[PDB]
């Protein structure tokens, strides 16, 4: 991880240009459904029953959106992502049980939504790089702890 | 392998796509080379991987064409593709691994031009599509 | 898809490997649970994960068992294991990524074991056979 | 990377106990077979048209036993092997067109082969523990200048 200044640039500008609070709900929503395993963590939260159920799940929003805000503070810090989420890597390992790579599946729903909303010309393939980037090193930072 | 509901899903929204294919191609293209620079190893005999470029255009279409008369085949995507499988395997030698690296790449560019229709069931729907389509691609390998 | 020789291939291995199926297994789980620590994830609910414990050696012998018992049905993986792709998916929801590494970790297991028997051909046809079960497993997904 | 001190000994133990001008050479030709789309870089080599021809190869051969030395200095610094791959990293992509993806797949089969040559015992679960983290900080290193 050495980010270039046209990374870093475009990682800030997407974060501020997008509502954590639409995307996340979203991003989390578009997993469970296209991601069915992951339920595993989720039956607790009311109806998962469908598609429509789950899309119209408040506690699944309100979940989607701790997620985001979760993110927020890796990219108020790209140098320190490791550290900012070692106590986040246990929890999910030793209380929670969360297979990590469903931490890659929910990086890619992220993504799919940030590109719904934004559409391909605000994101671009060269934001869509330094988003992927990103990404990938909080994904990394999420899985460290797991052993 | 889909269910008839997820063939219906597909049809559905390759309706939108369909008049943008050419775009879509090039959209996807450009995406996969740029943000998962692995894959560029495949392309350094073109002119240029940059995003729009002639070469990614004139590829970006012939990817999306063969992407759209799938869609026609998904009663038999295994039995469509053997000879573009053995193609990539024995010609090209691509590593199989790739083909979902693309997948991923067009879902991206779907959302993004068809951000209302591009509904969670439709994702899914078309990721199965495109799952099976990239296992497809891999069947004539080893 | 298995060739004929591939099949004949994983047949003969086999042959050696069924004397120590238990062993095998057991190696094979420690191993995943063990180098690929992403894979507990499953498996907090019994009484130990470590190499060789009780419930590592019960549940080894209940994976090869399956393997040894797939390997008489070459023809048909996929149905042949349409139950426990279901078992899998709906009951365990275990992430089909997953079975790649449980089959890495029996290769290396199986080389271990059988250094001179398990050439490169041999290697080949098992890992064609093992990324095939993998893919039949996941078939009952979504 | 942070190593734990078993990981470090189990890596520089299991370093110790074998030949690399041994292991390198069954390791490639086990990759040219099993993962037969990397013949595309070797078809200068000589004869490679079916198994037999290539593990024989005294080309596949020495270059196996050139892979091997080339991991001789991320054991020797265990710390810095990022910095350690950085002229090789862009020699494999800009040079020779290695899809980063076949480094995995070689060090899935120097694994096999380590495994194969020390046995279970000897190459037990926590050193194959070690040896795989070792294995994918050198896969990302050799990955890291593809751009
Ligand atoms: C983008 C990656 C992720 C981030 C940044 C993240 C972050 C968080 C945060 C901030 C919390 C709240 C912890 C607290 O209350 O102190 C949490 C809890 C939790 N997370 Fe994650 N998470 C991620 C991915 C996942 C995934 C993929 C799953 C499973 C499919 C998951 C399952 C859970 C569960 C079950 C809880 C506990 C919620 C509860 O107590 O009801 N997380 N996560
Ligand atoms: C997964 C969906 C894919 C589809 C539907 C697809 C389809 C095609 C088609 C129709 C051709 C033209 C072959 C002909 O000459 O008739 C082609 C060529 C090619 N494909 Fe793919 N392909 C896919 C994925 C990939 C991936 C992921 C890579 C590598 C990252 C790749 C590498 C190539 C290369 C190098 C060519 C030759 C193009 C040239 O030399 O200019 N393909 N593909
Ligand atoms: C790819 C080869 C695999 C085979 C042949 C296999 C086979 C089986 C079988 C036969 C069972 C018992 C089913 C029953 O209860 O009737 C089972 C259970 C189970 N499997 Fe798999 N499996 C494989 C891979 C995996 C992987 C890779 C994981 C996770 C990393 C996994 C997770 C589980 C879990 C959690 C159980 C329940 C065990 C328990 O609760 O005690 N499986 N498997
Ligand atoms: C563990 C992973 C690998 C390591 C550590 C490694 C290391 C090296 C080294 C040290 C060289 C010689 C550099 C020099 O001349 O100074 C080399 C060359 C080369 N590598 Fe790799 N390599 C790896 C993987 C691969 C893979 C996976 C492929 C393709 C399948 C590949 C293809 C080549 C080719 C074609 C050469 C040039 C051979 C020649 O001199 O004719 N390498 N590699």
Known sequence: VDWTDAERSAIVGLWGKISVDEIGPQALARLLIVSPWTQRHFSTFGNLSTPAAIMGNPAVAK??????????????????????????????????????????LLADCITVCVAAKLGPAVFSADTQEAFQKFLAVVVSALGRQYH | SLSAKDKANVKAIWGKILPKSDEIGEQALSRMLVVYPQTKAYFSHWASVAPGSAPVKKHGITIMNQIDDCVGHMDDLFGFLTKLSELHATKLRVDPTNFKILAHNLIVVIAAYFPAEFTPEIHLSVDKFLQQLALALAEKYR
Chains 1, 4 share one sequence.
């Open chain 1, 63 to 104: 979940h989607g959106k701790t997620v985001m805000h979760g993110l927020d503070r890796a990219v108020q810090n790209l140098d320190d992502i490791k550290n900012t989420y070692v106590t986040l890597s246990v929890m999910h390992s030793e209380k929670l049980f969360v297979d990590p790579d469903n931490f890659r």
